[PDB]
């Protein structure tokens, strides 16, 4: 893991000595090469974690996002052009560098053993989403974007700490063994209500939650491409991922205290596929279904069956690639014609002829493509609620016809019928825009093929 | 002025903060306050406005009647139990007008209306001066006497402290009055650890001394009052808007950055008590508080203001100052996150 | 453009909370979240009555 | 074969590296609650070299003979 | 009256054809654009995504899988051999107990 | 935690702190700060407007051996302030060993836990 | 309706102009100094005779 | 304790309060803190006297002159604020506001 | 905090002030002597908690 | 060259630059001294 | 002052009614009390008799606020016959917050007074159930 | 810089470079009209330094390299567009009047340094009072709105008033058809197509609003037309008067240590050039002043301090 | 060929760096090198050690 952090640090003074139109190739290859080195990683077997390097430990919890950001890293690297090419060499340069050091903030959040030091890194996750968003966001309301942003994570997740604290000078240490393997179970007193209540609500506000949710689509619409698909995919299934680490406590009473999370995420589950199903401005739709998505996690995780995490970590996992994926997708059209409305562009099956490839397979995917990871996760969520209830299956299947349905929506309006004949300034579609669609739609169909790789440490 | 005689009243400044830590008997304290009170008035009023004499006037009215009260608690502490030790007194009276002539001195929320005035009618120097050592030196006398504190005195002063220093600065576009009202707030952080564990209270002086320096230097990068002169120090030089960016979010405190290890200790070893409603209370406004760094930020360092003309002039010439000691500062006030264990240097 | 910009984030200016707005906030926000609540309290009280009492059909029921 | 031979850990080496790792953070964790209860304790009674603010010297308490006998 | 501003109408939408019809998607520099098509396709590709399939095609048993079948294997073959009953029920031996009375 | 027989004044390193061994050369919180002392020299060179990575490198130096001087004997202070804080401890521990009870090792045959099954 | 208008009302809309309207009653204090040694005074006489500090 | 210090103590009081609150003029309020001057100073002597504590007798003379050098700075300040405006009044400091 | 120059340099330049049972100049005791003697030797080497017990 | 009338520095001084250095390569001959010192301290005293 | 809030929490909760409103009460002029000192003294309300309005208003809001609060505390403890759940003092201080609300003469004011005074009031009533430590340990 | 506290601790005072040789003339006439013949004429034969008239590309040639900066860096006056249309509303009249009086503040400062330092007095030309007065004329042309007025009302508040008006101040008279006859016979024909009650108004806010308000501080000097060349009157009227009034009686060297650590470090005299008011025939948006400062970066010498600056030499960066 | 084009050298150099490094921390954290009560061989027949 060491040697996995190591030259991420060294990675950083790559772009700061190199000269200019040489930074790019530079930058590309030696991200590409940690990314086969981090493909290394995979020796985790049967009885315990592989720990090491007293801090650090891997589940497969972690290994399958570990890989997942830097993977995604690369991918990102290569998409954030065309819309900073003709700025400056100095905030080229320093917007490469920071994206750099939030990766080396997310992998140090993602190999936490003791949980102060994840809170440190989680808010080191925080902090340069901010600055990129907010520099480069390329819209009128970014500011206020940022703003609510980052009062929303931090005061959620600030009482968080307190609670850590008071359970790191009660107990002992915060390994995560020793959390485990010595856990006592607490009753249902007051205090424990609300100290349950400090972690689940930190991390209710980062998923988010349906009460807590505006904080993601303006942030989202208003944010640059690398800043969004980072935000979406690595932020709130790194959310997804402490929930799963910090769930290992106060097992006897979140029976008793987690019933109403559970009906305000269902009911917001749909409420939330209806309010994208009507909406104009592309961009939104695909925050929409993020927030459908995690409250479909969030179920997951309150209810406390091996099959649950299982489709759990496989929902993270492919919803991540998916709703990155159709992000980049809306940010080509969006280059293409510079409207960020969804109405304007129709037609684009006889122009741009084999993006509706793309578009086709990233909505199926979003459909619950019959052997797709996303079914796979939404399908045992579905059978670990029905055997918690007999009732849930409803929303379910209700969630899963609105989410058909915008989908098709999606498909079928932006992307269908009629070329508008007033636009004049569409190109044949690009190389690297194809070669992002390749490298999005690679590794789902690889992992579609043997997934056993990515299913929870519940296994 | 001259440099003869500035060197002679920066000595004599020196002179009383090291006479109030150094000694063992209560009239030298007082002298020491009274000195430093006498020393401190011309160094502002460096320049002659009226400004600077409503200001100087205030501060000497609020200052003379803070030490009047300091002796008053002394000679309560004689009528009692007589000896000249500094320590423990012998009178929850004496405590009480002892700690509320601290609370005028080095500004508490009921006593705190004169620090945003006289920051405001001063140059910036004056302000560096006042703000570090005056909050520097009756530390040490909390320090001397904490075995005897009534804690709902520091509790009250603390809490409300950080809760006015707040709420004021939501308004205040001026960027002397923004600076004040941090001062009250980490003068709260500082305050309501002392009767826990007071080597947390002394770093985080020595931490938000070191900050206020680093920012104190980067607004004399040039002079600066409101927000709208950032924006143009942001068009003629591209590093103070970066500077401006850490050193404001490290005033915030978050956790990848040094301004989170006054908090984080703090909240640590306040929470081996049980005391935990006051800690996340102040955790919460301590969110408060970062809004208008947060605003500043996003006025000047994230955004760009729209400029003026003999900009282009100014571009030719340097920015010629010399800097106190800017980047030792600077780096050791942002990157300063993977030492906490240097928590324990002090004792 | 206008359009857009009338149905996206001009909603908010204006608004006062008024009494049918507010009266019918409170009806279609808490309304059927407290009405789902009260149906799984429901299903749940009588599953955990239902083995409490010994005879659930848990012939095999393994994967739960 | 070639994989496990040239690119992994054996699980005796993982093993034996989680088991020692386990022990040395049980001793972190059972210095630091003595640590805190020592610390409470020892503010309570005072029975200990921490907790002791700075009382009276005597070097600087004199005697010899004075001018009046009844002090 | 009033303009509150000096500066041009800007930019020209420069749309990157017409200029380099052979060009792959970013700037228009003809040598590095073969030296980044070249880059993704090889060092994305033929190296990354062909060798990590290869590298988790076959891995050791993930989770100890095939050491499971053939443990089990054994044990069933030794539980209906001896004449035990497979699976038997209470995993610690009720002998190791000392239960609370009344 | 005040004096602790302060006689001998604040005293940088006293003189038993010689019985612990100093921190080794290469450590890596020293490294650290030559690090930063690298990155001080950078920004003082990013302040003024002389050219960054070059023109300076006297003061790189300069700024590089002050921070690992000062830190080197920050170090030294810091281990012996973490072996006192251990010593008094252990030697209060020795004090009186009777009003600190070591409880009985029951094993789990006998630690009764109430069950609560999670569905 | 319930989205944008109520949720934006309940939790942004209500803390921020809490915080709004005490900074437009803290900092607006016009520039004299008999309030504010009125201020100490009633500090002083309120926290002896009526919340005790002194015991 | 005694009688002496009751009313030596509500005279330090009032003086205070008289040095608190206060109308127009700033002359008068810098005298007033002379006065809890003298009170400090008569209180501190009988005190040392009563006690025959011949050691430290240093306390009121010094006490004085210094607190005398503090009211000295403080008419220097009055009468700056009288040369830049034409009276010594509460009002003309309505500027610089909050 | 403070500092110990007044220790470390030895010469006790404030330490005459402080109390009774000293150099008073021509000696002569206060009122009150015997009673400070006996209380600081009381209380002198002792962790001044357990010198409240 | 090129420059006309003020080149205020960049003409090298050359107290300072010998001062740093000399001040700087004495501060790790001493340090390295103090560490020597200190090895052989330790193994002396235990 | 600690007098009146230990007069306050002496009573059991429970029936011993109106001495918890005459308590509460008690607590309203204090409030007012303080309020009214600073806000005379922070404001030259130009006259003396306007600033007996206002002081008569404050005080009279807090002591209405305590009045009801008692009123509705006692009511709702002897009906429900719980004297150890919160949600009968959450109830009270939404009645408090309300009636702050309609003495103000408005409607955004009055209900998240009721949400944040009853969300309060149930913390208050939780930590004195459960056993919160009152300002200090001060221990350690 | 060899200065700070330490060389006036050292270096006694700045007294012993004064008087009746170092001082402070300023020339001030109508438009092309006293200009630097008399200048020159009173610079070579009273022994005193020189210093040019203040047009746009000082700030160009005053430091670095001599060579003029093209206007889209350091304008953007445009002022033969000034000359001939000072009415259209796209802004060319208060930019061009704003950074003149930059132009006039940064040489007047450079002045005050060479006066004190070294000696010998200079003379100056077209000095920053008469720029007010030119704003005063300007607008009694009726060319700039009023708010834009009291902006520049706003700048001569702050500006001024850190200073010591000078010495002398010889004004000099030429009637309307003599400034008219010389511009018309020079042959600049963006200056050929000037306008006459302009120069009208300057003449009446340049007698009335200038002379009663120098009362003594600026003693004057009030010289005709033909007053010129003839010498060796304005010579012995510089030397025969005695000076008297203004400030510059007593400093002594508190004041005079202030001024020459307040003209070095020329930022400190420029802080206070943007207010910033937001006047939309000044402000300049981001997008532009970008390009053009990353484009002022791109100029051989500019680019990060050329008293380092590589490509120019100097073959001292320490290896 | 290095010194020509030397940016493609140092990811390299700092993976072989940090893979070193762990190769020192785990020479460090190894006791319990046969105290387990599940891995406890003869250790057999070359030279003294059987895994690091
Ligand atoms: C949301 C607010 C969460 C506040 C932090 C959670 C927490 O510790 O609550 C219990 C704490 C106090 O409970 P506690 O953690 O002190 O538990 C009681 C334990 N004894 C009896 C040993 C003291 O309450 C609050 O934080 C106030 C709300
Ligand atoms: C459960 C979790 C709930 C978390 C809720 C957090 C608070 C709500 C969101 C915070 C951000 C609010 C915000 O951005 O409001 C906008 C407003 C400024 O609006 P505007 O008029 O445009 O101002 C121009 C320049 N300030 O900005 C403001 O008014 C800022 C006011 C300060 C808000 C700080 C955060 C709350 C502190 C509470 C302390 C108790």
Known sequence: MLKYIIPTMMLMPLTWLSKNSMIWINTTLHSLLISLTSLLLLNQFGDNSL???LTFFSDSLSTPLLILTMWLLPLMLMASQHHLSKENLARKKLFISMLILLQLFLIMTFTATELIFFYIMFEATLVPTLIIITRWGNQTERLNAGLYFLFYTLAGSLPLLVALIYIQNTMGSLNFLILQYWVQPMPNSWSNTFMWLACMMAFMVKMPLYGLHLWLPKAHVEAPIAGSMVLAAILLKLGGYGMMRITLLLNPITDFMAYPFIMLSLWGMIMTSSICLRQTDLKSLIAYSSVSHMALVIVAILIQTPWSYMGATALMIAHGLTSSMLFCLANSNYER?????????????????????????????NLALPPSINLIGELFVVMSTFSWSNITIILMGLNMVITALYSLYMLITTQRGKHTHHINNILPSFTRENALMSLHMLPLLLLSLNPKIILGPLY | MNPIILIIILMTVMLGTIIVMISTHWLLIWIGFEMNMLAIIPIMMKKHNPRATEASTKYFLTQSTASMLLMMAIIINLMFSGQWTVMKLFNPMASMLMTMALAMKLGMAPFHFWVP?????????????????????????????????????????????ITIGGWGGLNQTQLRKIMAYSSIAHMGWMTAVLLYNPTMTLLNLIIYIIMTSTMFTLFMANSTTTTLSLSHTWNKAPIMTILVLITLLSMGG????????????????????????????????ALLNLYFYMRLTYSTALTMFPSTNNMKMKWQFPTTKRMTLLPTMTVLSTMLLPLTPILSILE | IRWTCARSANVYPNFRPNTKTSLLGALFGIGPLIFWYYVFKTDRDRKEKLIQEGKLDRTFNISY | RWIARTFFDAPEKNYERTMAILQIESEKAELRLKELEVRRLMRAKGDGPWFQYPTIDKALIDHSPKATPDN | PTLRWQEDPEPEDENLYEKNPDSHGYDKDPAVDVWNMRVVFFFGFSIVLVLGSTFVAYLPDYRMQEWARREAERLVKYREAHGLPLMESNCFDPSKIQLPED | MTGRQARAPLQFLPDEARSLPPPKLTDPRLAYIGFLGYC????????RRRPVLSAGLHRQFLYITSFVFVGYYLLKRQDYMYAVRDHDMFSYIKSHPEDFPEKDKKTYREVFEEFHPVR | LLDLIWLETILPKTISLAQMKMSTTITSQKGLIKLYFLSFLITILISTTLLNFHE | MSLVYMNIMMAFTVSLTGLLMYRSHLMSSLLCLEGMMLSLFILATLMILNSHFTLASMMPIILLVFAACEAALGLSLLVMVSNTYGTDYVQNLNLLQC | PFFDVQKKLGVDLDHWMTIQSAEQPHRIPARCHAFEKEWIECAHGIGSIRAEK | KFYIQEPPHGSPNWLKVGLTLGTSAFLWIYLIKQHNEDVLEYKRRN | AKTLLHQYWDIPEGTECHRKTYAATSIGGASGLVVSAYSVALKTPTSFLEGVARTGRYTFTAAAIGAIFGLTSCISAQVREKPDDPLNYLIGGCAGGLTLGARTRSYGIGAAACAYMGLTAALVKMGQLEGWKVFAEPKV | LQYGPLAYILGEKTTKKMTENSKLITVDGNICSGKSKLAKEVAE??????????????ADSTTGDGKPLPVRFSGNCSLEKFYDDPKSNDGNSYRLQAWLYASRLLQYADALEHLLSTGQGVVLERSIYSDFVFLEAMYRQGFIRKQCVDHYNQVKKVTVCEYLPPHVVIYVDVPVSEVQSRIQKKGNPHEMKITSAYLQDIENVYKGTFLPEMSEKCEVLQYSAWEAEDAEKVVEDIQYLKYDKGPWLDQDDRKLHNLRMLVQDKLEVLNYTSIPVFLPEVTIGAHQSDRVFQEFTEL???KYRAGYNEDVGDKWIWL | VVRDHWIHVLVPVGFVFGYYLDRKNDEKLAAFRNKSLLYKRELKPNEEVTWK
């Open chain 12, 300 to 302: 051989p010498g500019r």
């Open chain 1, 51 to 53: 720990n090491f390097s």
């Open chain 2, 117 to 161: 005035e006289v920051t405001q009618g001063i140059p910036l120097s004056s302000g560096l001066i006042l703000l570090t050592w005056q909050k520097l030196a009756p530390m040490s006398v909390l320090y001397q006497i904490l075995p005897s504190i009534n804690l709902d005195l520091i509790l009250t002063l603390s809490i409300l402290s």
């Open chain 2, 254 to 285: 978050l956790p990848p950055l040094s301004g989170f290890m006054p908090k984080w200790m703090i909240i640590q070893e306040m929470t081996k008590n049980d005391s935990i409603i006051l800690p996340t209370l102040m955790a919460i406004t």
């Open chain 1, 337 to 365: 014609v510079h409207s960020r409305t969804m109405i304007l562009a129709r037609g684009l099956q006889t122009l741009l002829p084999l993006m509706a490839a793309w578009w086709l397979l990233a909505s199926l995917t």
């Open chain 12, 45 to 58: 034969k009273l022994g005193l330094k020189h210093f040019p008239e203040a047009g746009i590309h000082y």
């Open chain 6, 40 to 47: 001080s020299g950078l920004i003082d060179n990013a302040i």
